[model samples]
Target: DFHFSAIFQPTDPHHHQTEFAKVEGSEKYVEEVEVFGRQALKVNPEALTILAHRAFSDVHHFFRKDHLEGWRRAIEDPEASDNDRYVATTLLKNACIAAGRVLPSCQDTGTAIVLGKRGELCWTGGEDEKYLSKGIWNAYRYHNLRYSQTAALDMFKECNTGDNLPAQLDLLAVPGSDYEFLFIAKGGGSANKAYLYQETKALLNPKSLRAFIEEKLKTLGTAACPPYHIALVIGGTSAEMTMKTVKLASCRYYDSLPTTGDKYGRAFRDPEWEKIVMEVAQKSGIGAQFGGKYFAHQARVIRLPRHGASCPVGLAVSCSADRQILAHINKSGIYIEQLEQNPAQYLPTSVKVDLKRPIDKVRQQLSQYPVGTRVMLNGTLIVARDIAHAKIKEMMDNGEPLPEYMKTSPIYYAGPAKTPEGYASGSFGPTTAGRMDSYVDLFQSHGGSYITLAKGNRSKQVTDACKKHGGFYLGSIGGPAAILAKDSIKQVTCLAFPELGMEAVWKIEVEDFPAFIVVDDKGNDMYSKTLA
Candidate 1:
């Protein structure tokens, strides 16, 4: 019996042929080897595991060159607003720091998505998914990656899977020479941004379609972080399929598709329409999370034939952590997506910002500056997220004393991954601020959370509460967590809720933390104008 290992060896190809020839021993040399009653190239299960683990690990650390170049392009373009250029420059710097790999690009390492196209000729002992999942397990378990998966024991209760097991694996059979796979670690923020619309045939016309798309696009807000790579899928068999296509398109997985559609009813990417949609995004006044001209880096419009009675449109975005890698397995060996190993090549001299002002002066600036004014926060940040906020509210409800830090220090709504050895903190970035909007008025009324920092737009209630309570809501540029850990974050110490893991309350010291005033003391909101 020939025992093949999943681990590939440089000499194994020739060695397998020689061994098989010896098995026949001059009678019959190499013909078609049958496994599972079909001619197949046997792949080692361990190889699948190894490849999956490597892919997950690599994507968490490094971003694709094209994604980074999108930022550089923003800075280079003269028409880009100063706000856009500053964020683009800051993001590039973040990529440079994340090259260390100790800290991932973002604290939300995301759910592992393995899209596999198994060739008919390839064999993994009929357990391909298991092996791939094992690899995903290894990466998240051994590394400092965060576990974002939650297992629900009951409809009302859930618990973290702890190891990030049970990845979202979608495998399809394809006619090909090799087994191909696309791995994506999609953050929850972006994944939650997916939207599906059911429209009537009447709206399919150009004029109505334009209006419909623009309205839906604005509702995407800035939670997932921009400049986004957006994908729009119009007319699908079902809403679910349309959403799937939107996700793949956002990843550029369908970039190889034909540019025009034919009678067969295949989807096509319309570059002209894409340009029109992207221009609308630019003019929408939502750029890189604050306000500027870089709302979307690119827009992809993929049109698919729909049922005459129903038209389902899907919209999705690839956030700043746009991470996906294509891998292939064939007779020669395994090949993985090549990512930019050294991002320093793309870094530029630091953009000068005035951060020498005292902490008191900075607080003054936070209120005095109009909505959308970019400010650098240099002081202490009380790190907390959903659980902490809930716990704080509970404490207040019970008449428990709130921590002094929450009263004095600006609160940063974030959760951080495990701190690597010799590092101050793990990838520490802001979470969606809107989630805590409900707690704002109550929390601020108690003399805590007077100044808050987080990402994305807040609700009108938050704006009203800020006005009544003399508070501020600062918008931290979403994504670029590794840069926050390595550059801005000087220290991290847990202040509460150590049992919550990444959601544990933390006290973080910072210098020149980048942010914009989204809601100020004047009942003004940067995002409210769009809503109005």
Candidate 2:
């Protein structure tokens, strides 16, 4: 009999393909003993805390080797577009700044995720989640990171948790006496890009599937930040399984999986389909965050087994932030993945514009440059994002005049991490620009927000509004927050709604701030052809 089989059949099930560093003094956290004439390791609960704390702390400041290699390749490849090289080089520089251990790599520090497998023979005092949460608490509390988790007091009322608590921890029991883990710092931008679709057998054909891939890939657009590590999972036992498989695949966890399926219903990594995805992504012209060739760093496609009557396909992407760490624990002591420390070895732009004058003068200067023109800004910016935008809208509805600050200088959609002592700013960067698309026309028409700056492609309504209202939208590189903070931001001060925390309206001075014209005063958009 073929017998019952596990879907995953990985050649390197133990993760021997990657390298790790032994946690110093971690040997003291475990004891070896014989129970029932079998050898087992008894781990101290504190070991979990120490491992989680260090893992979370290190992941934000460093990146996995594969990610760094992709950026390096993007820079060196002659076929890569100029925009692609620009984004890649900027991201690599950001890694260098983050490695200093002062600012995190991005402003959105991310939601904590731990995919843990505990060994059957390993013993520890039960309450694992509590200790793991405490470690997560420690990382956010002691480091210069942002607290992104929010708690709901009511169906409509919410407040910040302040410590980024209540992480997603999934612990499973496995064979042998060693524990393994995949830790993720999942940011809001890319987290929202994961999607699942329900379909039928009619889509199993090559032509249909290829069309589906193209159509769905375009839907992802550039909001999540690229060059993306894209993953596509076809077929699954359930929707959740499909999504989980896609997530792990995007992280390259299934890199060692068998390339072919078997009669026993084992899942497989589809090399052919993977190549198809990479081809499609490159030709898409979405590029890293702007328009060009490197829409994706790489892609993973997996085939899974599904019930006779059900079929599900899942798609997900890991953004430029790209924060994840693999680790394990054994008698030799705990080991965490060795991320690239000296990212300089992997290393590989813009005009100058003044904004110290009146808003009309700034608008007049920007109007001369068409969409896709790169420019550097020097002067002040009004920093405000989601909640700030919402409160301002409500104030307008109540007949309150548009705040004076909103009418002056360019409006930057952003938030920053904790400001370290003696620093002008923390790891500050642009949030997704599309989220504020609806507010653009209204604010611009009200004699403010004539010049807006953020990241990613916006909706057609935004292009229309800008054309109608004579406003301009600038696209900043999505990642590279650490470098932007260290090199550009000069001063930061909360201007309004101090109670809103990081989302509070703030004014910041800058020098040599880089951006590209995305939407222009005329009916023109740089991404109209690529991301449309």
Candidate 3:
């Protein structure tokens, strides 16, 4: 006798539990037909583009019910620290701003990802990737989203792809006459947190597995923004399979998996382990970037069959952006996931620091506060991120003094999306501070960058450099980009690096910008005990 088994058996394979909004008159795009007595769907390729465009647009502006529920739960949970509620509330408000459709929820609009389950009987001219990408392009090109894709011009030279092109289209052939899709507008920072570990059977024991979960969760820190939807996968047939499973799990794609494994090597979700991960997250105290109890919104754990000798563990998170939409094309034409448009129902800061005076005076004023002290910043901030930092350092190396703009005010590690017609800025928020840690000491020593602002934890080098150079690192609320752009940023103007687009060196005037001191001038790091 021969037996066969599928790796995953999800009860909600069609995601019927998710609410969907039908595109009116979309039935015009498909025709029901019988080919050799088999029922099939003749789909117009335009439906692919239409569904994708709407899906991408809606996803950037809205979020799923479970994601919203996580934030609301954080606010209502008494065990959640004040900072946790505050961060959750802020993210909710950003959702409100994004709902207006004038700005995206985050500055990083995202890399378009189309995961398609096309039925074998559904026919669409075989150009699904092209049409899907066209839809993705339409959304980014016609909307206020940012173009974040980078192109390698040469061995070392790089340029923004400018249109956020080169979509990730993963289409699979399944049985039936209906096609289903999961469209993800995943941020770069969030994608970076996807990690894989190669291990042995030594990690399979109960005690070691629990310890392993705790150890890996801490390294996620706050760079990608929390409260994160975390996913952990243990044991896979291959490394790529494990990573893909973890990524999908983080998006709750496997929420309906069986809770217990079967003898036939079927994949299952481990709720018990998920709870353990949640507990570890709460106990870790990394919490919403500024220390509290909500480091993760929730966790998912999937156990898959693997070869006896190879153990591949995978971890990933869906960040505060939390964007993924479900859609289907069949007899009904086109239907898209219905994200919470009325996010307003989930509705929900700090000391004053001025930067107009001498840079030293501002540094001295910030010195009065300890690490973790929340401060409201008023005045000018020089905006820059990865490329600008590299350019500035290169300029310094080429015998040019540090740019005066870099020396005059605190540097904000950020890159803005396209500014709306009459707005001072777009969805501008702090980028990962860890990426710029190497430039801290060198820049500070040049009589500038005494006070820097960004989000997330940094290395000992940053803590040590700040101590040695009388500098500080400020941690902003990482996820609330739209809220920050609307409320605090007053004026923005490019000051240098004109060709770099968003990565240009720019000066912005801000009023009541909020941040927490993460590293102090005297070597104290707020994240030392937690993220470290």
Candidate 4:
């Protein structure tokens, strides 16, 4: 009998060539669309060619050497006036450097947005609009694409649907010289840095802007990637225009400026509005990511004259990922760049990796990876996020079984790079321990010797659980995955979500992977103990 016996006849000769043949077991028709030179019929191939190139450029250039590093270091130096100088500098370098070494590439996979001016669009077969949508759809769905979601929501939730579907689009059919598209992808850390202010005549003082930026930095937290390069503009034809203009400007700030008068790109020393924000951000104490190290790299502000009573300023903040680019596409589909895309020519920091052994051998080489020691990791570490943890908690709640290997094995609370061509993860660093505080008891409940890894402090429940059990909490060096991935890797195996790209679980075998002890099983917090 057929699997769907009720839906069809088992073996009638007539059904054999029809419904039976149509069944999945019978054959697989052309279920996929193949692309080659002059492929299908619907939209102009140029649209896709242009969009994909733009996406790649956006991510690479944003973090490229041309501007990202100088801006980052400038803001973090203690010599700078604002307290933010230290942290801003640290955060940006970590982001750019880590972005540089994303072997297989995963984290900091920024949010993509496209702003456009109308043009004559040609379709291969369908409406011109459909192809524009299709072009974006394909680019985002590409296996290499990674989105920013730090494992807060469930994978089954609305945001976790296919290939970052339905990109946040803002397209206008405005008049322009030719077809122009501004493509960019900003990660959660950087995008969250964006701030808005509606200025009134009374508050027209420039200091008000400074106060708002500084205050926001204080409350905004470091979740948004730090050492931020803020791209902002004041005044527009409209509010939407102001926002769109700022985003477009973000694509331009780090870009090489024309060899003109008073150009201080590499030697930029003048204090501007952008510079002001970076100083305030670093001083706010959020530091890079979580640790109160650096705030932001620098801020870039673009302003235009506003009406008598209203001064609307839109700020598009960029973090370490710096995944942004400006492409001027001609009708002939030619890309005219004043220079080539060579991050090395500008940001000349080469990220190297050494893979020879597993963690045991790695820890052996470095004396258990003591604090202040930096080791490059090349190996496999499991990628566990919300869903993976949910499964772990369910097992605990049901009083079910516990896996054998995890007892002595240390657990790092992070989701990471995909396997197959997986060399290593991108910017794959530690997440906040507070988020995983609930799982402390659950892991101990596994009835095996348990240990947890985190950088920041943990909850009382977690501390209590670790003390009650013979488990200890370890700490990994915070900031930058590029440095960590530089460690040696032995092997990698995939575990969950074939469709989830980097979100899937992977068992990583690492060598000399770095970590420190902050919480001991005896109820003593090393970090706090030392402080006290």
Candidate 5:
């Protein structure tokens, strides 16, 4: 059945669409049992079993693809090197594999960032404007409870929507009726990583962008969720223009000339320009080390005469779940919708489970499992992050009586989530748990178990505490926000932090949730294991 219909204005008609499944003893009345019960039957077990294998297979094949071979193109350059190439390829490989298993189309449901000049185009078919808006609505609400938050202006908590709605549209009606619509699902991770600056003439060289990217990668690194399709938008007069241009560049990947819209613009498809930029982009150790591939898809430069003297550039990155669909309509506004329909396509990738191994054995096994291993984490642990740790730390410093429950389960070090209908949580996925590394000893002092999270290596303090206190640190996939949410959501308890916003600790309960061993029973880490 069709899932979209258009309306004049965006409004919340009824809380009807929002209601909690009532189960008396379930406390906040989460219909998780009802939801997950159906989930158990609806899932394709065979497909689920194969997902992890396919991802690893994809990783093996990823090294074989033309996209990957392109890295050699950079290595051949006089200035490039083996170290840079190695790091770039390694990170890229990790990103590609890890990204394959994430849910909800990456961590961010994304808002369509679009920019077009007014009076520049003609609408020929299929309720042009009406259908376009309808299409956006359909996409925003596509997956279950899937959507993005509004940036800066979102009234909803986290300043975004439950269903990433309201495409950020910019229009400039031109005199000649030329129109170009660029649609980009700006994933939150890359957007958060966006760097815009006016570089001096000296800084705008073959090495500048590369150096900048390398440094940023060092800091943000996998946090942006790698194996990403990165685009740098240029020819903008200012930082804002560069930013907007980078977003508009998204249209190139998915949007083509509309058959019905009579639109034209200063469109320049210059391959030489793209090549020149690629030369500069790949020179960075980042391209060679992080991405398994050789060269970027190509440096896309939209050359528009901007304010004289100022060279502006905005970089936007889209995670591996690069979802951009095209809807072509005839003069009558009729178009067919064809989306991949495979239950197998949606299942979580799986890695072989070593049942005999607990958190310790898994840590040793993970380095060999490849960076993108899709592990089904089993066993019970306490979950807490952000605010909970902060409060717990405060109490520790103040010598307050620690709660009895704090010692009962392994603290997950995750923040609790808040939703519209006030559900116990919405997308309560793991954040950068390394931020709580300082509190490792504190939580351990109270009998914490394992800490599972994403991004990068933890500090020595955390590693030491985990070893000393018999705590383990685990790693979860970076982008599987929804998939993690969907994992049999067991018991979700609120942390004692009201002021932390999304950072509050959530004592979550799950059965064999998807987690991999990072820090082991002996306090060994993946980084060390990788070295061995």
Candidate 6:
């Protein structure tokens, strides 16, 4: 039943169909309008577009209540390191600034994903997908969001779609007379963490399953941004179904699932296993981005009935942005989930830290710190991410020398969003360091990328390379993009590849930038040691 051809076909082939229409604004959809005899809700195409725009706009600017609460807990935890508390405080301030709507919480605004169940009685004159797509397009177009989707022109070529369009829209019919939707702007880091493992029934035993899960969890590392809301789905009717369950569970959408299943065959949340997994994460010593205890905030372990031949396990996380909102349209009017408008209320009166030392002195002091020590940074940072890294690799292949700036400054693995008018930079945060893991040794040997700054954990090769080259990898807080933009980064300008937009090579000046030593010059990788 799966139509692979339709999935792979170019989008333009179906654009000529009259079933789709784009709505410019919400002026056409007045609240006064009514439909069926039951005082029906009338939602226009423009309204859907506006709703999409509003949802994306809100998620990028604010954290959910639970996410904010997680930070508060970290700050208060007696066992948390000074670095951990500082990170939590800075993140809280970031949420406050991002709520101003000028800067997003993270540079990657994410792919638009809408899951809706429409009531049999409700109507929108059809073309729900088109309306949603139009709204999604407007959000990505007018806002400072990034354009992540690339269309495949052919087997050999691909290009950015210009505007983020053709969103992932999943619609269903339900018995209710109202329309309800779940909107999720899922970033690439967390989305890529979704995994599925097909195992035999023999491994499902308590001891074996525990050991298997522990091994798999270590591989997740810090790529998706930790203090994660983790989900573990065991067994399913099919691999696809299991994967879907993992996604929903990670979003906490399945929080109300039955605690115990019946003979009729149903999924259940295993409370006991949830605690076990969370404990394993804490004990594993890979804390929030560095080395402490808050590796995960909470975990959902869901068990589903499966066929005799298959035992598929799925894992997923909501990441740092932690975005998911509910929306509904009914007899009254359209309403979206209310996000925390004033996150500043959660901020403490003051935070204690010492980063006022001279830039050279601080750098010299940092050089002597051990693997788990956290340091507050200031002064210059060389900013670059994926495309720039690839280009650098090309230059190295041609036997070209690295630029002097790269060798002198610490490199930040990041690509910023569109810079607003009058701003020095956009919401900028570190991207997953794992993606650039392969280039570490070569780059370091060439006398560049010695002191690297980025989020998440690196591979064994990076550790070995750093040891060989006397390099270091510092872990930066992943989710606080607004804080980095508004406070830490004082200025920014392109150093190379100006045509790459956010992915361009840039020189940035930072003040009081926070980070922890993950891989030291001695080759001690915090993550590697923790996993061991």
Tens digits of lDDT, candidate 4, 307-424: 6777776777554555544343333342322222343333221112232444333333433333323333444455455455666677767877754434434566554433225555
lDDT of each: 0.79, 0.91, 0.91, 0.48, 0.44, 0.78
lDDT of 4: 0.48
Against the true structure, whose TM-score is highest?
A: 3
After superposing candidate 1 on the true structure, give the runs of residues whose Cα lies further than 4 Å from its correct spot: 1-39, 348-365, 395-405, 530-532
The local lDDT score (0 to 100) that residue 63 gets in candidate 4 is: 48
Tens-digit per-residue lDDT, 1-532, candidate 2? 5598899989999888888999998999988888998888898988889989999999989998889999999899998889899999999999999999989999999999999998888887777789888999999999999988878899967778889887999999998787789999999999988999998999999999998998898888888878899999999999999999999999999999999888888999999999999988888888888877888888999999989998899999999999999998888788999998999999854668899999888888889988889999999999999988989999999999899999998999998899988999999999999899889999988888889999988998899998898999999999989999999999999999877777889999999999999999998999888766
TM-score, candidate number 3:
0.98
Which digits, one per residue and each the tens of the lDDT, describe model 5 over residues 342-392? 222222255654423454454455445443334665544455654466666
Error of 4 at 381 (Å): 3.8
Steric collisions counted per model: 1, 0, 1, 44, 47, 0
Q: What is every candidate's alpha-carbon RMSD to the true fold? A: 7.9, 1.3, 1.1, 16.0, 15.4, 7.3
Off by over 4 Å in 2: none
Q: Is candidate 2 or candidate 4 better by lDDT?
A: 2
Error of 3 at 314 (Å): 0.4
Total clashing pairs in model 4: 44
Expressed as tens digits, the lDDT of each residue in 433-511 for candidate 3 is 8999899999988988888999989999989999999999999999789999999999999998878888889899999
What is residue 32's positional error in candidate 2, in angstroms? 1.8
Candidate 5 residue runs with Cα over 4 Å from true position: 1-103, 112-143, 147-167, 172-183, 207-220, 233-235, 250-309, 325-331, 334-376, 381-450, 456-473, 480-532
Write out the backbone clash pairs for model 6. Answer: none
What TM-score goes with each of the models?
Answer: 0.88, 0.98, 0.98, 0.60, 0.53, 0.87
Give the per-residue lDDT of model 1 (tens digit) for 1-532.
6653321112222112111101112112112347757665667666788788888988887777778888988888888878788888877777777777778888898999998988787767779889999999998888778887777889956567787777989998877446777899999899988998888888878899888877988888989988899999988878888998899889877775567766557777888889889888888877777677888988888888788898898999999988898776766456677778887777652212333443344456566578877777676788888878888888878989776767867889998877888888888889999889899999888878888999998888999998998888889989889888887898999888877777778988898788878899998888887644
Q: Give the per-residue lDDT digits (tens) of candidate 6, residues 199-262.
A: 8899888999889878888888888887789899999888998998899888777776768766
Which of 3 and 6 is ahead in lDDT? Answer: 3
TM-score of 6: 0.87
Q: Which model, 1 or 2, shows the larger TM-score?
A: 2
